[PDB]
RNA sequence: UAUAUAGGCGUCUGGGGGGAACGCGGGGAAGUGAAACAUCUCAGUACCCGUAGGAAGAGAAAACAAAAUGUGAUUCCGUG
RNA sequence: CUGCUGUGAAUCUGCCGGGACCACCCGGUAAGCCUGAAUACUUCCCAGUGACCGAUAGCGGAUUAGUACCGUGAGGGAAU
RNA sequence: AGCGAAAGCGAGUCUGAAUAGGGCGUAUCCACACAAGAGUGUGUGGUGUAGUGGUGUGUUCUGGACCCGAAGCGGAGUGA
RNA sequence: CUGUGGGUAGGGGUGAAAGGCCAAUCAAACUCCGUGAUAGCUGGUUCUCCCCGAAAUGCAUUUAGGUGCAGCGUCGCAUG
RNA sequence: AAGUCCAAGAGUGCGGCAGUGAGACGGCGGGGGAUAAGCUCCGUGCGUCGAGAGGGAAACAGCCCAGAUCGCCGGCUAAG
RNA sequence: AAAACACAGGUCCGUGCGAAGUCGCAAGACGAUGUAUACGGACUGACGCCUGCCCGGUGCUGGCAGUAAACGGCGGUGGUCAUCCUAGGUAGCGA
RNA sequence: UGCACUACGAGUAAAGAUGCUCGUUACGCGCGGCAGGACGAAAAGACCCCGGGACCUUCACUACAACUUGGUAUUGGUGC
RNA sequence: UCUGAUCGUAUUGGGCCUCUAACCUCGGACCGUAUAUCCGGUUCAGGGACAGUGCCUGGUGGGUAGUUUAACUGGGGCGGUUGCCUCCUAAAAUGUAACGGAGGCGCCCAAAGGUUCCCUCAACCUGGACGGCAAUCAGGUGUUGAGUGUAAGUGCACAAGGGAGCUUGACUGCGAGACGGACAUGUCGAGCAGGGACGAAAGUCGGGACUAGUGAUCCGGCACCUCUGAGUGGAAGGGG
């Protein structure tokens, strides 16, 4: 059978142009009042998945 | 499975945006590459391509 | 609820740009600070909502 | 069978990251602390939580200044 | 019981049951997976019922399509 | 697209569709039917083939084989 | 050929009031200048970018999935 | 009391009620099928040599005899 | 700064494959216990066993000596 | 194998008749070829004793009259629901 | 039913030794008896804990049967 | 037009009363039928638009089914605990366990935030109507023993402690560089630009002396926007 790949990790996960995989940040969704502008700015933007995870990452998006 | 914790695959925030079934995109080509392909004529069209 | 959480919006823009906490047994009626307001991109005097 | 006792909360990780002598990029964490055990000195910036950061590239150089225990920051030569 | 019908009587033509797979229509699980579990999955599967034919079904646009002077019944393959 | 229950239109400036809905354009002419080929399968015969088995294997069954035997029965089921 | 949620633009692009900074991208390397010394850039020139199709092997996915092993669950039948 | 012939069938029967009996079995019979059920559990896993060679820790866990990531092995490439 | 440096078969980065995640005792510093336990929980570029044969402790995983490529009816020694 | 079940006896609830109840998707069946002195369900379990202060009216069967802790109340209080006579299986009676 | 020309004491050892250590005793092979050991046989401990299941209960959750309240279709006419 | 101000005026719901004709009757009589408590038909007698049944809709519902009912734990249970912060344990970097020893938190503040300027406490002694060891006053000692919203610790007399004035930086677009780290989280941050505050200026200000006061993802609200709109233009919906 061809090789289905995850739903929630091809919606979560993205590649760039050479191949890194990029991601978002978490705790940015609601209880945002009592966050600094300083926090929310950190949790912002795509950062590149951890090291430890690509293994699976690549795992779950390649499928 | 992560052995009962939440899943990097379930606790991160989903991607932004929406995916727009009507994109138009182009397969694209530079300039110098034409100039190196087709040296010494012009007259360039989609099939010349 | 003794301290609700309250938004604060431009009076000239009328766009709900700040967010606070504010106590209600303490200031009964409205905060009117004078925050700044990125659309008009001045500061003008905010309002509670 | 039971007390009150059991409760802890985590390390913060709190000490000097850079000792005298190692050469510091601006900016760099130099001293995490809780109150002001150490206090800056030039080139020597206090955070909000009393972290204590180098203004300037160089060298660290703990020191006093009238009975105050001082981080301060050399101009490193470039030879 | 009147109109008549149900019914009765006679006569001709047929059906009935079986069969390994394949078809069409209908009814329809649970084990399992989800590291529990109920939605969900398994699976419209197993099984059951009706009913064919050598195949069956479906078929001749109250269709797609997107401004292309577009294609022009259905079916079944490969892609997508 | 269809299934049950209510309500219930028009016949061509009619009606249906173009993924809520509205207007315009486009496509079609529902509520009637039939229709091969291209596709699925092998109970059973004719031939052949195997970098398949070779008697504890290959069919349960090269031998009284669904036999002996076991079970009230459904059924299980050899060895040579 | 990439960047963006996308419209879109394109060795740029997104954010942004910003020839402000940052992300992502411009195979890489080399030489010279112009700057710098908050960790190096910025330009120039050359240099040239390597994928894909079989097949072996190691993992992994869907399938029983290295082999053996429950108590029990459901369907249809058999038994006074 | 007993012969002969019958009837009641599985979430069902029958029960002067014991969770008794229903073909040597009953807190839901037997058979076949789904089915090679599933098992974080137990057991088993078959020829040789050469080279290298651990861990029994941290964090998280419907988690504590399981697992994910890090730590520690090995192989390849790069650096040195 | 040297040292080792035909090696530690070192370090780092990135990839294929892991296994491990039940430790034990002894020497030091400690908690709990009665400053009991062959108790229990920690720390220790501490050791050994685990996964380690040989010599001593009588026998005697973890103590002391010492890390087994093979052969010899050759020498020197460790602990004792 | 019993102290358990059953039992005869009793009490309550339901059922006015293809009844209630039960088996069936229904049709139908049993109940019952029975009819409230009967049938079903539930408790108790031969037999005996223990044990109501006495009838106006919330109301009831209705023709005024039952009735007993039918509902209080035991209170005056006979007495033993009997003359009159009070909206908790209850300390009536407290034996 | 792993073996076998299968002693005893005191030790040691996964802490209850035919098998190890040091000693003590014992000629080889049988027959009839006893039942103290071989942690004797038998039954993958029923106790206890962990995981799965089953059946039972309920003012656990979610459903369904059954009962039932309504609207409406069968469903009509007269009057007020 | 509606405005008078309620009279006629058309269909129409609800209620009541019935009626027969749909429908119902295991009430009777016949017929099919020789046999027949089946069944159907005819007829009379009763009900009757009720009932029953269909679709829809609420309620009761262990009668029945599918399942859930945590882990740690000096066995299990009972009892306790489970996240975050602060000490000791913890062996002078970081880190470090126990059902080890003590405590706190799930906020509060529109000023207790920003800035400018100024000041110094606690306690003791002296002597003054209430006044007392003790409210206020004066003087003298007083160097940190007071305070710091809130636990503890680290700090802070240069004050971060006490006052007064003005303000909203409890900003917007960002952030080189680092700390902590399985990962997800968590931290700090110079400096640039825009618009401000305070200060003559230098400059400080992206909440509070610092460390607790919190909850991923999914899903779904609200406001704004230049995004997208299933043929087109809108909208719906989606997006940021």
Redesign the interface.
């Known amino acids: 059978p061809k090789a289905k790949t995850h739903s929630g990790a091809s919606k979560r996960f993205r590649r760039t142009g050479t191949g890194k995989i990029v991601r978002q940040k978490a705790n940015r969704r609601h209880l945002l009042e009592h966050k600094p502008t300083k926090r929310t700015r950190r949790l912002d933007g795509r950062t590149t998945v951890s090291a430890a995870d690509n293994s699976r990452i690549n795992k779950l998006l390649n499928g | 499975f992560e052995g009962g914790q939440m899943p ?9 945006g929406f995916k727009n079934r009507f994109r138009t995109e182009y397969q694209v080509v530079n300039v110098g590459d034409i100039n190196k392909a087709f040296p010494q004529g012009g007259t360039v069209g989609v099939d010349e391509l | 609820d003794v301290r609700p959480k309250i938004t604060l919006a431009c009076e000239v823009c009328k766009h709900r740009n700040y967010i606070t906490k504010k106590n209600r047994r303490n200031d009964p009626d409205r905060l009117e600070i004078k925050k700044f307001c990125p659309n008009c991109g001045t500061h003008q005097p905010h309002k509670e909502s | 069978s039971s007390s009150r006792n059991g409760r802890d909360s985590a390390a913060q990780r709190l000490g000097v990251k850079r000792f005298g002598g190692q050469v510091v990029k601006a900016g760099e964490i130099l001293v995490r602390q809780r109150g002001t055990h150490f206090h800056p000195g030039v080139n020597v910036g206090r955070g909000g939580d009393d972290t204590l950061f180098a203004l300037a590239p160089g060298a660290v150089e703990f020191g006093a200044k009238r009975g105050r225990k001082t981080v301060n920051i050399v101009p490193v030569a470039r030879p």
Do not use: A
Not at chain 2, 10 to 16: E, G, I, Q, T
């Open positions: 990097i695959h379930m606790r991160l925030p989903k991607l932004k």
